[PDB]
Protein backbone atom coordinates (compact mmCIF):
# COMPACT_ATOMS: atom_id res chain seq x y z
CA UNK A 1 0.00 0.00 0.00
CA UNK A 2 2.87 2.35 0.84
CA UNK A 3 6.12 2.87 -1.05
CA UNK A 4 9.61 3.68 0.22
CA UNK A 5 12.04 6.13 -1.38
CA UNK A 6 15.79 5.50 -1.31
CA UNK A 7 18.11 8.52 -1.39
CA UNK A 8 21.65 7.94 -2.67
CA UNK A 9 23.33 11.34 -2.79
CA UNK A 10 27.05 12.04 -3.08
CA UNK A 11 27.27 14.26 0.01
CA UNK A 12 23.78 13.59 1.36
CA UNK A 13 21.96 10.37 2.26
CA UNK A 14 18.60 9.46 3.76
CA UNK A 15 15.40 7.43 3.54
CA UNK A 16 11.71 8.36 3.65
CA UNK A 17 8.37 6.59 3.21
CA UNK A 18 4.76 7.59 2.59
CA UNK A 19 1.39 5.83 2.66
CA UNK A 20 -1.06 6.48 -0.17
CA UNK A 21 -4.14 4.74 -1.57
CA UNK A 22 -3.04 5.52 -5.13
CA UNK A 23 0.34 5.32 -6.86
CA UNK A 24 -0.21 8.63 -8.64
CA UNK A 25 -0.54 10.39 -5.29
CA UNK A 26 2.32 8.54 -3.59
CA UNK A 27 4.66 9.11 -6.54
CA UNK A 28 3.59 12.75 -6.81
CA UNK A 29 4.36 13.39 -3.14
CA UNK A 30 7.82 11.87 -3.53
CA UNK A 31 8.71 13.73 -6.73
CA UNK A 32 7.15 16.92 -5.37
CA UNK A 33 8.77 16.64 -1.94
CA UNK A 34 12.12 15.70 -3.49
CA UNK A 35 11.98 18.31 -6.25
CA UNK A 36 11.12 21.06 -3.77
CA UNK A 37 14.28 20.06 -1.91
CA UNK A 38 16.28 20.89 -5.02
CA UNK A 39 17.36 17.28 -5.51
CA UNK A 40 19.36 16.78 -8.70
CA UNK A 41 20.52 13.60 -10.40
CA UNK A 42 18.83 10.48 -11.74
CA UNK A 43 15.52 8.86 -10.77
CA UNK A 44 14.64 5.16 -10.94
CA UNK A 45 11.21 3.54 -11.06
CA UNK A 46 10.68 -0.17 -10.40
CA UNK A 47 7.09 -1.18 -11.15
CA UNK A 48 8.08 -4.61 -9.82
CA UNK A 49 8.50 -3.46 -6.22
CA UNK A 50 6.69 -0.14 -6.68
CA UNK A 51 9.75 1.62 -5.24
CA UNK A 52 11.51 4.76 -6.46
CA UNK A 53 15.05 6.02 -5.89
CA UNK A 54 17.13 9.12 -6.60
CA UNK A 55 20.90 9.18 -7.08
CA UNK A 56 23.13 12.26 -7.35
For the chain, give the DSSP string: -EEEEEEE-SS-EEEEEEE-SSHHHHHHHHHHHHHHTT--SEEEEETTTTEEEEE-
Q: How far apart are CA 41 and CA 31, in angstroms?
A: 12
Method: NMR
Domains of the chain: 1-56 (3.10.20.10)
Judged by phi (left if over 0) then psi (alpha if -120 to 50, else beta), residue 48 lies in alpha
**CA max distance for the chain:** 33
Nearest to 45 by CA among 12, 28, 20: 28
Whether residue 14 contacts residue 5, with contact meaning beta carbons closer than 8 Å, is answered with no
Amino acid sequence: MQYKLILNGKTLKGETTTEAVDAATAEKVFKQYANDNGVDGEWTYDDATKTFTVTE
